[PDB]
């Protein structure tokens, strides 16, 4: 499905899926809520564990599946946007 941007705070890490308290997500017109994201078979990096705040992108497939693609270190509201 289409890829959207999502920022939030890591709630917990899992084996191939992890729950992230993401913000509203202006890319999906969602609200801020603790939701689980599915990880790719490549696994997850570090610096994004329960307690971290990261900026990620995920693909929403038509079924309503939230599949994480790439996540990069952010630090509170990500940062400065031009």
Residue 45 CB: number of other CB atoms within 10 A?
Answer: 12
SS (H, E, C) 17-75: EEEEEECCCCCCCCCCEEEEEECCCCCCCCCCCECEEEEEEEEEECCCEEEEEEEEECC
| CATH number, domain with residue 24 | 2.40.50.320
**Structural domain boundaries enclosing 57:** 1-82
Method used for this model?
NMR
User: How many folded domains does the chain comprise?
Assistant: 1
Cα-to-chain-centroid distance, residue 28: 12
Cα–Cα dist 2/9, whole Å? 22
Query: Residue 10 contacts by C-beta under 8 Å, 6 or more apart in sequence?
Result: 18, 20, 21, 48, 49, 50, 51, 52, 53, 54
């Amino acid at each position: 499905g289409p890829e959207h941007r999502a920022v939030g705070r890591i709630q917990s890490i899992g084996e191939r899926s992890l729950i992230i308290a993401h913000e509203a997500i202006p890319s999906a017109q969602w609200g801020a809520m603790t939701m689980e994201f599915a990880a790719p078979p490549a696994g997850l990096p570090q610096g994004l564990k329960a307690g971290d705040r990261v900026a990620f992108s995920f693909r929403l497939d038509p079924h309503g599946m939230a599949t994480l693609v790439t996540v990069a270190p952010q630090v509170q509201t990500a940062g400065a946007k031009p």
